[PDB]
Amino acid sequence: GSPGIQVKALYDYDAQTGDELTFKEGDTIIVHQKDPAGWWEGELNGKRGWVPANYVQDI
Amino acid sequence: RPKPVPPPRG
Numbered sequence: 001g002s003p004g005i006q007v008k009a010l011y012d013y014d015a016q017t018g019d020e021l022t023f024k025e026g027d028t029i030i031v032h033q034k035d036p037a038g039w040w041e042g043e044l045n046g047k048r049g050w051v052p053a054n055y056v057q058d059i
Numbered sequence: 060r061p062k063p064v065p066p067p068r069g
Contacts, residue, residue, distance in 0.1 A: 011062040038066030052065040 004043070005031040007056040021049040029056055 006028050015022040021044050023029065029051055033041040042051035053059060 011060075013062075013065070016065075017068070039068065050068075052063075054063040054066065 003030060003032075007031055007058070009055055010057055011055050013052060013055050015049070017050075019049050021047060021051050023051075023055075031056070034059070 009023045009025055009027040009029055012024045013020075013022065021029070021042055023044055027044060030043040031040055031051070032043060032048070034053070035041055038053055039050040040053045040056075042049065042056075044051075
């Protein structure tokens, strides 16, 4: 199957650090880990980084 | 539409 859990972004987000992902509503984020504390390890367009879990569809 | 606030990063 896919290398991870694919989820849709619900809103645009602009990264506030170099280790966060920037994305737009409708992007498909690959989730690698559902880390505790509100930020998940994800991947988009060849970059690995943190995604705010409240910005992607469901949990 | 309005967005949730990102949670603390620390």
